[PDB]
Symmetry: D3
Subunit: 334 residues, 6 copies
């Protein structure tokens, strides 16, 4: 029917450039013969045509069938997708565009001892006649969230930006809007509440189910992208560690390391001998440790007769088969 | 309920900042006690509350009666206002936001020798079964424009941006979108056509009719706002001129320039005499000429014996009663 | 030793560039042959040599006899000058550098029902044993303000910056610092107090008494600078207005505007005839006045009430008065 | 066989952007439908076609006769024009692109007591065999300059950028190049000398002689262009000044002003009466003259000497003379 | 005389900044005590003086013997060098400064059906009476290119900038100039043609033959520069890969890998056992190859075919080969 | 009293941003919930509370016991700490904030043949009557420096900026100030001299002795901080190198490498066989060592003389020694 595999990418903003940067880091650089046209290509994967588009246009064109793949925030996906079974998240966490969609209410007067959705719902002020008015851009997700949390008496007004104005303006009581830093809303005398968070968004690789099950090339490129993306993301959270351990043999050392359950797993330790002039004073284990627990791991393996540790970076980590690929095939099935 | 008169200003972009620049030039500067909020005041006019909003919501809030006045582009006004007669344009030409909503088609294929709206409506390819597809943001105004120029075989897809893409992407045959500088649509191999323009927009002051009639202070402040805005805008296209004519009296000279009908009128000339000694060589006429016709007016005055001319700037020009104020009272039924 | 008149200008910040802007608007532009040296010149005044320094050092050098004139905030002058009689404020208000030195305390703690400086003095917790701890850069001015307000029980810690966080940090109970934008100290949960303002500051022209009497040309150039500065500052608050009025003579019209006391008190109106054309002459009369910017629209409405038609508003660049009070006041401060 | 009138404008740098700002200020705004082409239009003048070019290409294209008019620095005009009689400076002073082409020599070495052209010319070192080596961009003007002053023993290595290096590098003894700020060559241990500057440049309006005589509308638009530029430029050097004079009559006060010769020379003063009220009398009269900006303060002194009270200074956008002296000079250069 | 070894580096623009970044990436960082001067130095190599010059002055000074080494574009080398045998290209591809000198012609005109240089040479419009006019900065290389392709009906004009104008301006038929991104000449209705590329350029390391042969240190420092540069540039195209193979022995694994000819060319694999968690030991074996970045994914797939499992990719900073063929080729050019 | 551990970090300038960069690279990133406060956290360490402060106030609060740890320059530590023995420098060398406090002297006048501190002392001009006047912000250190080097008659004037002016405006004979780039004082015609440097400075980790001994948590987090920081700083001066050697056996090549004393010491080499091809196996062996960056090329020459060929240089992000010399030094400073 159509020859090329079409990837939609954000066109404007920091979301656009962060996406292009992530792609360059995975050897999926975008190239553009005509810089102020909206068509481009990733040469790494021939037959992959990219189309710069606004996040919701990407969701719209995935549904309408004019795109096969896309990168968008989970906010825009769940709002305009509306739970359509054709939209499949391939990677749910590209580690940018971090924000959450949450409820904000005034600190001020009638809301002062209210720090929970339970306690907000508990108030006597709201029956069907005078309901809890709440301004949002998420005209789909707001209703669904309130129904799903058993609150019947709410009325949503829509605004296309600057929602913080609504409570000061008197046009609503609460709001439902994106937050990432938390700056704006204390400065407009608003506050979040426990269980106010509707979802935590970030950039995601998304695909049409019909596109992937339909054409082998679409399934194959999605697989390549997934692997290249997670290989990059995994590596960004890992170091390779080279520690010098005391011991008579290589295999003796290997055990002591392999005994410690806290000590970081990978595929497994390698151990080669560290020479000196007299022969074989230390043994060099080569493991692969998460950045979060680097110092802990250094401390642990000092207790097990370790000495000099050499931390070096990783570019990529390709696991033989990703849990996400399994999960994706499972999401495709029905 | 509400006590205050409310002016909605654009919150974002060049539109926002140009608006604030204009208001400062007319002694209507906005002052913000809390810069991170959306509330503000214009000190010059007491009881006048400024809410920064998106242009779309300025229109909506004017209709929902949550704003009284607003500054907004005619594109956004006619699109989301939908001709609603509660919305009255007080000033239609604040001289920024200059752009036009017009149709653009490709220039390559079947359109190579199609340079008119009727020329493309004439084409056979478009039928009730497979019609002319046009991508637009202006979901309301497009259909309306096609009807009013007799084009029945048309279908409208929506998009949120990057409409230039759609012909190349093959999701549409033409687009209906804003154009100012005009570069963007050569860069995507598109062209405007004869009579393809739907409207020419710029920033405009508008007012709720229900607010003007039934809320105190609204018609008052609208009058002040209108006179101040116009006084500035008028003065921007004028110079005061002081030219030295040759003659034997003030009234002799006065009659010469007053009998030049091409000469630029103000309310009228003013003569004082220019002194010397060998007493009263030239006579100094002071008129007020449009900037557009300066050098012409200087040549004209040289034909009437004029020598030295001094051009100087004007800050404001207040006519006794503006035609725009008259036209408002006329639109109110008066 | 020295043979040139020296003007100290601020070296750093908005304060520096605001100063340089103001001097350019008054035809006193600073030229600089070596953009990152500290010496410079104002050419419009022969033998005037600029030296860029920190505000603090401008006060020091005025006192030390190394500068003759300086532009400096009143906060800095009073703190580092300490009411020294050699330092005279020539112009107390150049309408930039606006801020105030005021006391701030936490909203949260025991200070919820405390919004007056004597309410703060009233509180029982403080005594010579364990006094009111207060952080400030203004280590001279703080003590003086509270001695002068009869508050004996205070201890002054001294910081050089980031004072808004001393209460959070438990190093002091209140602070004494500058406020201008207003935002910073509500964001650190502090508040201002009634009577807690020590002084209003802004950029000011100061001069050395020793210099004015003792160095040739200083007083002459102080005079010129004062006059140009004030003319510009007065001019920035005025428009020239040309209203067209209805009358059968020049003087008839001149009365109706002069018998309106609400109408602006310039030096006085100028009436001249507006000619017009089958063959007629001289309908309106054009009065020219000099109205404050604040009350423009008011004064337009006033003139329309007495038969006014078209108003043309135009800018003023300088307004030189015959003799400013400030010049007389300076000579009186000098005993001249 | 070209049919439009063609103005060459600098395509690059601050030269380019100052040129466009000047033409905007004179209602000769440049409009460009395709910003990434080099062709453009000035709408105010019908038939006028701008071409953005590098200054030396502007000169080369005026000579080859692909342009009619151009704006370039007198530096590049003189270098590449070479005294060609087809080029005529219509305006030699647009008040931007200010720089001088001059000789710079080392401070440090055998030059410490050499502060003059003749002083360095007289020195015994330089001879037919080993000459005075001079690094320069200006390959035409260097030889011409030093022949015209009489320095036989000189050799001209050419370089096209970064000339201050040449002395320090050893490739030459002196440079000939552009200076403005005077900063750069203190930092490379060099100095200018007396009688060492070849030329003082700024932006200039230049016209082809063949174009003015030969092509329809060139001489006509050169006139318009000159008169609008000159009007703007004159107005930037002037103010209008209105002063209040105590007097009996308006001819009496005029006599007092006109017989002060050092006071400014606008075509002439205007006196109108100032009405005041007592009773509606008309005590003083309002003189309005137009005064050079540099001379504003003296002119106010000079007016207060003649019982002048309060002065209002205000700006001028343009001043058109009846016939600008430059137009008389241009016609003179054309053999009229 | 002169003691020091001199490297010319571009002074201006992006060429300058990219050259300085590359040298920093090779531990050949330039240090500059006086940023306003043109002299500087690289510490890592002793007695090496850096001089910032415009790229054509670099080529000019290499010829005159005032520089020993230089980094410039092959365009400016060939245009100003003119095949001079004193100039030798040591490294012809530093992977920045990429552009191509090519002929461009109109799209519209009569030129729509010519997309080849011989197809425009086939056009019979051009004779000795009225030849093919072509404007260019490259006055030496233009004729020499046209001569060598057999087109004697051409006359060259010279412009120094804004050459895309010359067709629309009417002053020439085609142009010869630099292209990289490709956008600028679409915007002026021009197109390239097949075979019309005169030269593909990039930044190159160049040396004077007289300097290498007859100056102490040059050949030595050239050797070091060449190797440090090429080591960095090679490592930018490579990764190191640590893949886990299923095997019964280390040498069994090594065989399976080396039996793949399509698999990467490291000097060889380094296999080591990977230990496993009751008392189990040593199931996987870890090879380390060194694959090009181009072929990474392919090579992972190739490895997974041979029972490869987890792969770890990590960066290289430098790859020093034993002998660089570029170094051997240099010595060859010195008759050595 | 107070429950958190408190680290002072610079609040303004490059000093502040370079500090936060270093802390980011050592997994000690600062997280600020409220950017417009001066309080912050490092999440990596439990109960650690960052306070942004001016460097002077970090020293002042370390003495007053309101902070436990700080990062400041050694310039600020010795001026404001004044050898106080509660203040202990934990790491003296964070490789940013590089400058030196040193005397500068005019080059022009009586000081032309004065390039030494003793030559300056020796000068007859200075006496108890009229001393050597020297301008400085370092009110404590200047006098102490002069008394330590027996300069008998010296008056010290204070300034808080723009000291380079002080000679030019005749208020001082010399200055004592920070110098980093060294450019600022050629511009203002000053020079440093032999023995001018009072101290060389850079950013340093500093701890309160009472806080280490008395407040538990501190010593533990100091250990952690020191180890992470030095681990980073050491890794910035190393590469890992993987040369491969021709050899018959594995400890044969280990020998030849360990016999070279000039070759890179780490803890020692590792070596594994490199396999390569009817059927051939195990030609050369891959040595892996850890060379300092400054000595990289030297080490590669060295390894080639031992029959080495290919070298693969790669980056290290941290090097953790088992126990650091600076930690031992810290303990011994706690009488331990
Ligand atoms: Cl936020
Ligand atoms: Cl557009
Ligand atoms: Cl503040
Ligand atoms: Cl210069
Ligand atoms: Cl290009
Ligand atoms: Cl410095």
């Amino acid at each position: 029917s159509r020859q090329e595999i079409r990837l939609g990418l954000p066109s404007k903003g920091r979301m656009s450039s962060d996406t292009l940067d992530l792609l360059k880091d995975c050897q999926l650089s975008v190239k553009q013969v005509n810089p102020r046209q909206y068509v481009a290509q990733i040469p790494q994967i021939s037959n992959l045509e990219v189309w710069f588009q606004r996040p919701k246009d990407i969701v719209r064109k995935l549904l309408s069938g004019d795109l096969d793949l896309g990168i968008v925030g989970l906010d825009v996906l769940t709002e305009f997708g509306q739970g359509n079974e054709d939209l499949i998240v391939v990677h749910e966490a590209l580690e940018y565009g971090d924000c959450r969609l949450s409820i904000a209410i005034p600190q001020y007067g009638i809301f002062e001892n209210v720090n929970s959705l339970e306690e907000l719902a508990k108030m006597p002020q709201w029956t069907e006649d005078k309901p809890l008015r709440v301004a949002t851009g998420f005209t789909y997700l707001g209703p669904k969230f309130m129904k799903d949390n058993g609150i019947k008496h709410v009325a949503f007004s829509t605004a296309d930006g600057a929602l913080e104005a609504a409570p000061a303006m008197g046009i609503a009581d609460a709001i439902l809007d994106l937050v990432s830093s938390g700056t704006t809303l204390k400065e407009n005398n608003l506050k979040e509440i426990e269980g106010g968070t509707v979802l935590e968004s970030q950039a995601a690789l998304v695909a049409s189910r019909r596109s992937m099950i339909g054409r082998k090339g679409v399934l194959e490129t999605t697989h390549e992208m997934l692997e290249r993306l997670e290989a990059h993301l995994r590596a960004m959270g890992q170091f390779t560690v080279v520690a010098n351990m005391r011991g008579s043999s290589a295999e003796e050392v290997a055990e002591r390391v392999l005994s410690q359950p806290s000590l970081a797993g990978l595929q497994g330790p390698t151990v080669s001998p560290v020479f000196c002039k007299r022969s074989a004073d230390y043994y060099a284990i080569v493991i692969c440790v998460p950045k979060k627990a680097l110092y802990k791991s250094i401390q642990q393996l000092r207790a097990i007769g370790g000495s000099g540790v050499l931390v070096s970076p990783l570019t990529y980590i390709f696991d033989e088969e990703t849990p996400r690929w399994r999960q994706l095939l499972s999401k495709l099935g029905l």
